[PDB]
Amino acid sequence: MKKHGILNSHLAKILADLGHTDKIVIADAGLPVPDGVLKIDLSLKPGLPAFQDTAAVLAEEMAVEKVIAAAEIKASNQENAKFLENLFSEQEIEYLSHEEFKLLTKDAKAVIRTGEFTPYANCILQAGVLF
Amino acid sequence: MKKHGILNSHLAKILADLGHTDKIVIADAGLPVPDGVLKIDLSLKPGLPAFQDTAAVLAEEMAVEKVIAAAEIKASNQENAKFLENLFSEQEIEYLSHEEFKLLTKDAKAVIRTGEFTPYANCILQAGVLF
Amino acid sequence: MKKHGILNSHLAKILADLGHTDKIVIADAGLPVPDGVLKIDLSLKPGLPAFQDTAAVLAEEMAVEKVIAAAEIKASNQENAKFLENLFSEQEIEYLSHEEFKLLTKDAKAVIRTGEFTPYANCILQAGVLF
Amino acid sequence: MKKHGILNSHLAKILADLGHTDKIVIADAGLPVPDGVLKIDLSLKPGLPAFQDTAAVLAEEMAVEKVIAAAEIKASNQENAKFLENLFSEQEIEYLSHEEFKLLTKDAKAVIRTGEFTPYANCILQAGVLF
Amino acid sequence: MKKHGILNSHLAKILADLGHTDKIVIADAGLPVPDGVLKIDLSLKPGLPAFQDTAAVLAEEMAVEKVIAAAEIKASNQENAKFLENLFSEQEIEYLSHEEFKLLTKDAKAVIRTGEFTPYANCILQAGVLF
Amino acid sequence: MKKHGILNSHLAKILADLGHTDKIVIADAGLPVPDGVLKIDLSLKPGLPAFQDTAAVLAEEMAVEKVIAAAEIKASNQENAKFLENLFSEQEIEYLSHEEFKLLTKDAKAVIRTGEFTPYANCILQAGVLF
Amino acid sequence: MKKHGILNSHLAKILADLGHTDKIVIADAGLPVPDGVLKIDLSLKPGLPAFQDTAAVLAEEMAVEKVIAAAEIKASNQENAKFLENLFSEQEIEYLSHEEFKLLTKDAKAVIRTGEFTPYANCILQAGVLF
Amino acid sequence: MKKHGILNSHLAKILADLGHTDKIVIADAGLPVPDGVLKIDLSLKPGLPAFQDTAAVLAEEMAVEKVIAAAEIKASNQENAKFLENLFSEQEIEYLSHEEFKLLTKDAKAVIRTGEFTPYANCILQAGVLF
Amino acid sequence: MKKHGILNSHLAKILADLGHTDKIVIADAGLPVPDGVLKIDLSLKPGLPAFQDTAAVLAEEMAVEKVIAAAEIKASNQENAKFLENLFSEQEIEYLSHEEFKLLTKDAKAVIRTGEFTPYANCILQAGVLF
Amino acid sequence: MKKHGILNSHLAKILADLGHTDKIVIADAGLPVPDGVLKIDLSLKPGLPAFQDTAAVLAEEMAVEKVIAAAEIKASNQENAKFLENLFSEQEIEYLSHEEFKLLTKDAKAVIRTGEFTPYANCILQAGVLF
Ligand SMILES: O[C@@H]1[C@H](O)[C@H](O)CO[C@H]1O
Ligand SMILES: O[C@@H]1[C@H](O)[C@H](O)CO[C@H]1O
């Protein structure tokens, strides 16, 4: 067995190919996935796994230089919005309209679907560099 | 969005094709997957999701006529062994040696990998019929 | 066997991947299917299954926020036009010319072909969200 | 549009390649489909389409020289057992145990899944020749 | 064996998927086939099969709404040109320059190559509707 | 255009790869095709193209060292049986039961389906060598 | 074995699909091949096979109506330039700059790589028609 | 970028899928790779990378329960044989003849080719379990 | 461009993957190629390229450990037989019956077709090791 | 085994297809790889293989007519910037902004990932010609 890194086999393969500026998406159960973008569905049931649990694991296994989210999250999901601001305190966090956000997901290497059943609980993690 | 059934998109597709006697495997993080058998990895980190949570969701979404498990589970994982006996009280539960168990997984339609980090926490669910 | 959700295996797989705003098409026996769009043909013979039977089952298994149809349906197929109004009384219904309608089918995740042999008996169901 | 023959596009493609002795299977909603065998699911809901309706359409679009069903159908599904005898008057009807029946389906060019929710409502149609 | 419809298996598959306005092309031995368009070659030797024989069969198995040919056919192949006018008396026959004709072939579902060794013996059949 | 050789593009490709002892099959409209063997269907309608016309073209474009046919052809299809004897007078002709003939088609590089509607009008052409 | 036509199996397949105006390229060892264009490499070692030998065989097996070559060939490779003029005296020969020549290879059905080690020893053969 | 685990992207994907008892092979530049086994070639030039460098990195990123090597390594490659003994001092090391060794490579998930130019410098690492 | 090694791109790819004991076949124009074995056809016309020319090039670019040919070559092709003996003076040359020779070709990584039009001008080159 | 040329099997296949002006990229561990471009990862651990070592091997196995690097390398990576100037003395070295550089990589036939952990250690080698 693999000794280090993320436990999920599908996710390990995606992280392995990440280069500077590549993007991956963490999404709630309702975000549509653009045609041609790989979808890894980790959901089991509503709320499992949660957006917070998934984002935390990725933050620990991936070098993130920037986080992108939809402005709407501040209005309909303060709970998760705060979590995001706290988790990525050192990184740059940009808010765009949800419409623009969706547009940006077309360039993602993958969309990770969580079981999160709350509004606009989605974010784009942009890969940094280790040197 | 889909109104009923299992939330996970990968799993929904597998359940959709199940016919009487078809088998699927729920497995801990260490079970090897036979070549040619589809692998759906739901693990996020050790213990998430747990064997119990995964087995419970499947029991509710799939008609199971028989459950197969390795005798070794009774010796090294009484906790999960009891859970299994309780969850599938109405179904037939058969214990085989772990070696035989692995052999049977070659005929499964899929292996669902959980984040369970305890010994022999694996079982084979054999599909029943609705009429 | 799968206990909940739509009975058709091909359809279950499509519903499983629907995200907010994704579209699927229910078509009569004559609608052309754009290249690149998956076609699931349920027809057996003229009139079986009917547009009404198909649309009703889908309404029960999918959360629809908007319905789109060709304006020509009102004048050439009153029975079915009324059926739609009644079935999706709570959703927004939009009428476009058949020409524009056909153009929209290019973005659909799938086209479900029925055995319907009456004019303009087609519609686009746009997925809503569960939270 | 195609003027003659069966309406279903998927089925038309299967019938087109049929040669003397090739086999296709008409199945109820529970029959498991062997790996590698093409599956065409026409089901919409329990009981639609019915085994009888599907078998009737195939009978008039395909030259059948022999029908094969499971003996169990005579005891558990007398109504559909009679339908077959009546529908395939001139053809040779052979009965086998359900187990042997399933073995034969591995050689089928395709399995057509109906919405039939009654025990052992399955049969294999063996293609005849037109000269 | 298949009881009704066109005898050729490849062609039956093409006709089965035809929807209103879909196009197929019947070509002589020299017409180039655009990249991406399926080619079904029925030629055996020069003159076999003939343009006329192939067109006659398709006219009988397909609902033709409109026929398109190159104006050059009237100048260099009056024999086949007259044939076309008579075979499709009831349908609309449009003449375009051979150059425009070729551009339209790129939208066809298939090109059927015949053994015809006479100039401009090509035509596009546009599918109609059965209701 | 290609100046020499067989006119049919599909067949030209198969002949191009023939080595000493490779086999191709010419079949009537009813011969079943083993799974995995390429099928090139040249049929248009019953009797077109005929078994005789197809065999004659192949004989002229391929170096045949041996011909294999079913014994049943001599009694059930005298006309074609005589034709085969005349066309391949130089080569060795071997007659096997039809059942044994069919097993042999498993090793063929391709089965050419003709429009022939007369019994046992099939034969295997075994490639010879040009030096 | 195939009695007539070009000996190379790869090339025989390309010639079989040629229609009026289709193009194939004969190249020296250095010509780059555009992505998506089939490359058939016949080279063995420098000078084997030569540009001249390859062009001569193709000229005898393909109906060429036009030849296109880079203007630079006349000054940098006089020997081959003369050869091209002699071999294709009947057909139309057009000279374009090498850069423009390369853009043209994008539309070729295939690039045949020879062992030629002399500059600008490339040419495009445009298919003619046999009637 | 991925923060933890093995640096090589191809290798990370292989490690991610390892289950208990799965095998991977580290090979010198001359070992033949069985058909069907994925080959990841890390060689740059003779001696780079070395067997020792490769084996050491893998030992750090993978939980190995058993090592298998060819007995011939002890006599023909003492330096490397000793290196293995030392590196995997805590694991079980099994020596088979090179012939039997090669047979075992057929079951490997992958063969990692190094730039090692010394005799029998190959080994099979058998994955252990983390709990 | 590639500076060193064999000039042919297809062949370079085959040589690159060769491991100790791997086999490639050099064949005359009539040798049949087993299903599943890659065929690289270098033939242009009869006699070009010659068996001798092709074998000479491979001998120079590949480390040959053993050579296998059919005994029949000594009887019907003494010229090429002597060539082989001289070219591979240092290597082991084994003669088997042509029938056994053919069975061994099924294990080859590739068959290289030459333009050789003389009997039994075929041979299997078994790869050696560079250390 | 292959006697001459680069040792890496993956790289050998890429070099084999190189034509005049084709490009390959040598990258550090952080460079993102455009979609559709082949990625060959040689990295083993940070610093192995090094940018210099990889570039040196490619230089002697590939005819390079022009090198392209990012201007940023001169300021952030002076050591590797000098290496390049020194290694490619005769070749033309062009510098562009890192952004323009990345755009050019979309046209590369492949990206070779090294274990180089230093800023802007990337370069594009443009293939020259051998005559
Ligand atoms: O689920 C997503 C969003 O988070 C929001 O709920 C709107 O619909 C989808 O786009
Ligand atoms: O992880 C599984 C078992 O559950 C046990 O831990 C032994 O190794 C694997 O087969």
Ligand SMILES: O[C@@H]1[C@H](O)[C@H](O)CO[C@H]1O
């Ligand atoms: O069948 C469809 C329509 O419903 C109408 O019948 C016109 O032709 C097709 O576009």
Ligand SMILES: O[C@@H]1[C@H](O)[C@H](O)CO[C@H]1O
């Ligand atoms: O559904 C089929 C049978 O008809 C019976 O119900 C038993 O299970 C399946 O094999």
Ligand SMILES: O[C@@H]1[C@H](O)[C@H](O)CO[C@H]1O
């Ligand atoms: O064969 C076709 C035409 O019918 C005409 O002969 C001109 O060349 C091809 O385009």
Ligand SMILES: O[C@@H]1[C@H](O)[C@H](O)CO[C@H]1O
């Ligand atoms: O069509 C073939 C035979 O020629 C015969 O007609 C019997 O059925 C098929 O096997």
Ligand SMILES: O[C@@H]1[C@H](O)[C@H](O)CO[C@H]1O
């Ligand atoms: O090899 C070709 C040309 O013939 C010329 O040598 C220049 O480089 C390539 O484009």
Ligand SMILES: O[C@@H]1[C@H](O)[C@H](O)CO[C@H]1O
């Ligand atoms: O390279 C391998 C071995 O390590 C040994 O060198 C013999 O040849 C191959 O099998």
Ligand SMILES: O[C@@H]1[C@H](O)[C@H](O)CO[C@H]1O
């Ligand atoms: O061409 C080959 C042989 O070399 C011999 O000519 C016999 O036929 C084929 O098997």
Ligand SMILES: O[C@@H]1[C@H](O)[C@H](O)CO[C@H]1O
């Ligand atoms: O790794 C590369 C560069 O060399 C630099 O480190 C910036 O990120 C990537 O583009």
Ligand SMILES: [Cl-]
């Ligand atoms: Cl990892």
Ligand SMILES: [Cl-]
């Ligand atoms: Cl479902």
Ligand SMILES: [Cl-]
């Ligand atoms: Cl039909």
Ligand SMILES: [Cl-]
């Ligand atoms: Cl090489």
